Amino acid sequence: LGSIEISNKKASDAEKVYGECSQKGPVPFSHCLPTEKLQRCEKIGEGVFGEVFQTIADHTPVAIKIIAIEGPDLVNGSHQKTFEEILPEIIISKELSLLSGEVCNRTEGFIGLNSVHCVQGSYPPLLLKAWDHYNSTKGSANDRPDFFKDDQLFIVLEFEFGGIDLEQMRTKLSSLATAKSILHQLTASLAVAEASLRFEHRDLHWGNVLLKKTSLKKLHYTLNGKSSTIPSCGLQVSIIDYTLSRLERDGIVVFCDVSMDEDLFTGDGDYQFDIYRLMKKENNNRWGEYHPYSNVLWLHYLTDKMLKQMTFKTCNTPAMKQIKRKIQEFHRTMLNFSSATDLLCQHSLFK
């Protein structure tokens, strides 16, 4: 009686994920990952969400993020996401990819999405092999994904490969001048996304900032019709992972309702876990609200990381001493701005 209304809702929730995937129904793994693609996979990352493999599509490296959905098994300590809970990342990963090709508000600072599919089956044995390798060489905090039955649903998002995350780059960043670049790129991306989409990332921990070498001297973005450039210092930053994000599409708010979560707001041993708490306090546990200040908080967390946890290959020179002094002033003042858009446009760090 509610059985009818519930399964009709499933349903429904299923019909929106297809065809946000432009599917009518689950496809096999080999639809997304033919043998040759699958043969080139090497596990590159992981989280509680699932697994990230790098491979090649059309002569180009891609990152494939695999998330088990809708099944009853705990995966990596957590429940699998439903059709209804997985939708936001899907929709948001889509909207943020399109920013690179938009006119008035334009940025390449988010990860490009090639495609998103809802896939059905057990874990490809070739992936399990790739899972095994990483486990032998980096160590996994994850369960081995070998228990999925062949009715098991996954979302596979195929992203451009953004390079390596800021955490892993902990000790490879050459100077304070680079830290300023990365920070400049992050603020501008967030600012472009704020202006186009009323976007807040809400989970911009340093594993979610990817860095790739570029031969470009200057990177370009467009904010409300005005193009400007950022000196690359040789890296392009990509912001990934929209699991907690919020934006509006036309005028429909899309977001991760965490209003009933508690584990998210009780972490410790990192400043990262205070940001979740500050966001909740600042938005009163109403997560559909627009609070761009949250982007500033994550930028403040990211700036802390740069000052406290980066070990650079190059102090150094009076020049970098000064930059150091500026990131430090940046760190002390940025919280007195209302948004990444306020920061980008007004902070002396970016002039």
Swiss-Prot record:
Disulfide bonds: none
The Protein kinase domain, residue ranges: 38-351
Binding residue positions for ATP: 44-52, 65, 160-165, 203-208, 241-243
Tissue: Strongly expressed in testis. Also present in thymus and bone marrow and low levels observed in prostate, intestine, lung, spleen and lymph node. Expressed in fetal skin, liver, kidney and small intestine and also in proliferating but not non-proliferating cell lines.
Active site: D203 (proton acceptor)
Result after altering D263N: Markedly reduced affinity for histone H3 and reduced histone H3 phosphorylation
Highest taxon of the lineage: Eukaryota
Modification(s) after translation: Autophosphorylated on both serine and threonine residues. Strongly phosphorylated during mitosis but this does not appear to significantly affect its intrinsic kinase activity. Phosphorylation by AURKB is required for full activity toward histone H3 at 'Ser-3' in mitosis.
Subcellular localization(s) per the UniProt record: Nucleus; Chromosome; Cytoplasm, Cytoskeleton, Spindle
Functional description taken from the UniProt entry: Serine/threonine-protein kinase that phosphorylates histone H3 at 'Thr-3' (H3T3ph) during mitosis. May act through H3T3ph to both position and modulate activation of AURKB and other components of the chromosomal passenger complex (CPC) at centromeres to ensure proper chromatid cohesion, metaphase alignment and normal progression through the cell cycle.
Family to which the UniProt record says this protein belongs: Belongs to the protein kinase superfamily. Ser/Thr protein kinase family. Haspin subfamily.
Protein name: Serine/threonine-protein kinase haspin
Lineage, top ranks: Eukaryota, Metazoa, Chordata, Craniata, Vertebrata
Residues of the full protein shown: 452 to 798 of 798
